[model samples]
Target: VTTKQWMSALPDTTNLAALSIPGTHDTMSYNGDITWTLTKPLAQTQTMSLYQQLEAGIRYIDIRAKDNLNIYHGPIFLNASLSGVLETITQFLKKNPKETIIMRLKDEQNSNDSFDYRIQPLINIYKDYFYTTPRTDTSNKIPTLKDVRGKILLLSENHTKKPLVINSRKFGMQFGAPNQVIQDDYNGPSVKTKFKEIVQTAYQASKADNKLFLNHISATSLTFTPRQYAAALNNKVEQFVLNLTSEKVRGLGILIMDFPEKQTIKNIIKNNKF
Candidate 1:
């Protein structure tokens, strides 16, 4: 409804690359333009800087880790399996879905110090669908720009010092509504449209049945890891972790249970041969 466009122009300043998980729609891609401007010019004491830039009215901002200069922008597909922490990462990854998850500079001469410019990390979750007050024309049965909220990356206390918290005020950052576009029962025009219909249908059915729940799940993908290993937990947190890159990093290669639902999780524990 906000006249939003799924296909975005690659950034012209940064040397970045991205990859994405295939969705109902064709894969979408965006290049990084590393060059950025500091809203607050640095004097000299600026010890750390950010590599990404922020547009005045843009809802989302990109942050490139010094070691990895790749920036990803996506029409990220939604998977029901991955929810909670995993879903957050999956949604984050969806922002820039590309084949090469990593980005490298061919010139090796460029330093990650290029990030030493005034930049702020911001998270944006957008939706295009019908709401109580239609933001766009729904007469044609199309999703409209419904909600656009700016989010912050709060640094986690237990994890490293980098920002890592998703402090959603009222339930915080969520994606179940718009996910239908990225992953519906049947493919549609683009993820944008499919997602709208998915949410709309769910809402309609829920209201008609006098019940409310989420449909079109990504729970299976959430539980299954790259090595095809799964953990013993099932529920939002586990499902969320699986949706993201839980196994890609080391540590809890065993954290993600092969089972992702509560009932199955219980049955597996009860029937384990080991």
Candidate 2:
């Protein structure tokens, strides 16, 4: 069977088991209004001579219209007023580093001639391989860092810099291998130093004249509903959308799928960036 049909056959009330996006489904409305669907697992493989074994390399992607005039009520993946499926997929692959992707979409078209909508893959793939990581050399003052080479994601941050370290066990945010940091001490820094010493030297340059301040910031967490989980998956999946707009677009319609499983829904939604 096709991948979409394969996934649909699985039982629900099931935990969010990590499965690849399986296949496609036609979008439709429920209770006569909103439209949505779960895409099959997505894939992205590195091919040599257009022939090689593929693995998970997707991080995230997005999709949009060529012009502002193109707008309609629908999920991100199903609106065709923007472009055709195969062409959209090809374009989506250009920006993202994934091998394959599947998306679910629907349109609130008034009619075939007048109605318009565009949906594209917001696929987020997992990292499967790695390479030598660079370390910062304290002697150099400012160190050069390599962005993630394969299936890398450039996440938005607030002021502080975060490093990409090796977690050889394929660890993710909440599970698997712990983060094994690369030494920050470059300048041909000796690699045999203690981990703590390495951190003290290469990673950060302390400024005696600099001041430290703690503003009033609060921390919190919450839980997610099944629908919320779907929304959460959608948010991450759509990270793959990009460059579809002729000019800069404001943001992806990522809110439609805000599933907060750890913190309160309000806090989760508030804390997340689009």
Candidate 3:
């Protein structure tokens, strides 16, 4: 298995949820570095660029959208546009048809324009690269690897009553949909307790069928920056995966993380069974 093209090695028939996938929490927080002395502490959760993260075996992405659909973290612009992100990602997907990408599209800051109204046209530009089904359609089973190769699947983090819009385009899956079991507890008093809960959560999530087990071991608080929390936690995550029982390695779902290291991700990948 390769770190850069890890999914390429997996068979096309492998079920998406059966593998231990790695993802970043902020996904694009590394863009603006001019105020890094301050920005790095408050918002930055990644050091890798969007494409670089994909190259490092990150299949799931969390993108926060703002007015005009500009990429934002909290309220600050990250110097990126949805168009640019789509272009970069589509370029990557085109070059690597074996890879399928899942993006969590959340509208973080907006005004004047409804999140859906302003974003659809841009999304329409790349409709060819999308793997969307109507949100109203729930009968189709979760797709296999070949089902969405070279396509972008939308994992909607938005809470709009108006269905069929934006990147979802009238049909992407919901973040908290019935088929999903998600865990993203970012606020905590201590990392140790959080880590313990994560392992327990993973154990439960891994046993289910037809579910998207979204576990985020990413945390940050008043006492710790994202980097510090990750420095302490990712190593343990690495060790946890490294020591997984042969059976435990079969289905880890998607592990969303903060500042995932190279070796940490490698441990997660190599544990996968064919």
Candidate 4:
């Protein structure tokens, strides 16, 4: 089978967190710039389109949103809407029914508008393809692959505790919830220190099959732009993923990356061990 449909190779009963899934950080940043002065040149982290990323075995999508629910990368508008991205995902999901996608959505704009108030409308529109059980009270248990196939599992950042929408803060599993672990040390003192956080978190996630883990190996500072930070860290992170021991292979949670190569993703996929 091709890297395009690696998850289809696994058995249906596999838990979602028990596999090493490759994902792109700020998945829509491919549209903006990071070097040109007039535009948001510092926002672009990817060169590939959403479909290409999916084809390259990226199972998770990191989306930071603006007030209008458009994709955003820090200060830059990604020029792609959440609906458009979902359309891209739906195209892939329909073609390959055995697979699933976990979209980790965060409100990057930090707008005065309520985060859920902005997203709930779109959630209603995309309800058909979403596995929305985590938004309900009965869904503390992580789902198995069989359970979430042919669907987009929403992983929203818990922005509000308000009770207007029942569990509005939850997507599938809320970000800071007790059952999950996340490492996104975006303000590391140095690139060297940043990647160490990446490796250590990945190592921990590799063995912890029961909890949801998210290790963001992407970090940036003014001195080291997103592209530069990605360049400095991707190789070593790739090495760690590729060189993982067979026995300890359970899951590396979701290894979120920036400007990831197909080979690096394939290496991560190889560690699924099922």
Candidate 5:
């Protein structure tokens, strides 16, 4: 069975908060239109679809969609629609009722549509299958496997007033997280050295801490294209993940990356056994 269904075999007392979950940086940018050239080619960020990612053991998804419901990376159109992505995810969950996926939806380049207007359609469709309970507590107390099974846990990056919202300065916030930190620290001269350092920082700080650990392993620099960055960094991160001892691995939280390899995800999901 897949890692998504792995938790189903475990007892209900399992603490999902402490498990290392593999995730994608841009879940639906696999089919990006590179002709736009508005930003670095994001088409190379991920080479898997939302369904393929789930089958590969990704339990978390980072989505950047516009008011038109289409996914994008900066100004680059990803060609996949939000409804289509959600449908795929919903289908996956329907077949794997015990698996749970945490989706972080960010509003990208849309100001005319209100946040509520953008997500209301999703809420209407997936409300029953979503984890809508307000997370007033920290990440350490994140709902257990039994609590969120077969559901899509929604985390909004916008200022929308939605339940179960998690972002910086909100539930399970991490300082110097994801985007800016990854961008500023990106190093083509040093290769994957900076990426390795940041991953270690997030991994070390998360163990036993009462918060969500988001280890973003994607980066872009003026020196390299998005494809090159993903290739170099994914290799290093995979090796680093595989080298971790069981104890160290157990401490790993959400590992957000570009083009997550199948074996690498298997290595991270193995931590659930600890």
Candidate 6:
């Protein structure tokens, strides 16, 4: 089935921040640099292009830009520039006006630029599309679909003090994947089990508060490769969400995964139903 604009599928009254949205770990990790491939050939977490990812119902994006202003998966260059990704998002928003995107723009790979400098470009391009403090607040009230139509909710991990930019602290409860480097027998099954525990904790936290819940369900260490670990964990988490009651699913918050397959994303969207 064609992936519905899942963000638009939520009830009109649903709070954009509180809804369970599918996201990518490193949204622009599709391209790998020579050094990255030489070191960790399996380090890439995403395979789909940015536009394809948006079309596949991913509403949240984790973008790491370096000093040179290129998107990277750690030290590896993804080849796609930040400007290009935003352009794609802008075009997508123009066509899909009812949709909104939540972006966590962080400076990684030792980018020698300030957060304000990095964010200014986005403001220039998406002046009309960026969500502002007046549009979103810490109030218990969730912004309606109409409130954020054709806009981008900017969350800053670099701690840029701005009105429209939500700081990393308030970006919601983000649970990182387990670090298997120090673990004994840190293989696929063991990592999957640990990842499940993290997700469950995130889910439980979501039910108790209105904060944006960011469930990072992707984990990778030397032994546990990104592709293998992400797929295995995605299956387990997908099943966990599928098995939840509709109410629980509706409160799923934001889920950031690696290698999010078509059907896996569809299942998460299905949970948004009333």
| Best-matching candidate per TM-score | 3
- Tens digit of lDDT per residue, candidate 2, span 122-169? 111223322222343212111011222222222111111222223322
lDDT of 4: 0.77
Go through the candidates in order and give each one's C-alpha lDDT: 0.22, 0.22, 0.78, 0.77, 0.67, 0.67
Give the per-residue lDDT digits (tens) of candidate 1, residues 32-107: 2232112111111111111111111111211222212233222121111111222343343355332111111111
Better of 3 and 6 by lDDT: 3
Q: On residues 142-248, what C-alpha lDDT tens digit does candidate 6 reach at each position?
A: 45667777788766554333333334223321122121001112334466476756566556745643456666777667676778777677888887788774445
The all-Cα superposition gives candidate 3 an RMSD in Å to the true structure of 2.4
- C-alpha root-mean-square deviation, candidate 4: 2.8
Worst 10 residues of 1 by lDDT: 19-28
lDDT of 5 by residue, 56-171 (tens): 88988988877778787777787888788888888988998988887877888535437546567565676667765445544334567787888876666654433324232223
In model 2, state the lDDT of residue 31.
12
Error (Å) of candidate 3 at residue 7 is 1.8
**Candidate 2 vs. true structure, TM-score:** 0.19
**Cand. 4 TM to true fold:** 0.89
**Residue 221 displacement in candidate 4 (angstroms):** 1.2
- TM-score (all chains, Cα) for each model: 0.18, 0.19, 0.91, 0.89, 0.81, 0.81
Evaluate model 3: give its lDDT: 0.78
Clashes of 1: 46
Residue 177 displacement in candidate 4 (angstroms): 1.9
| Clashing residue pairs found in predicted model 6 | 67-111
Error of 3 at 202 (Å): 1.3
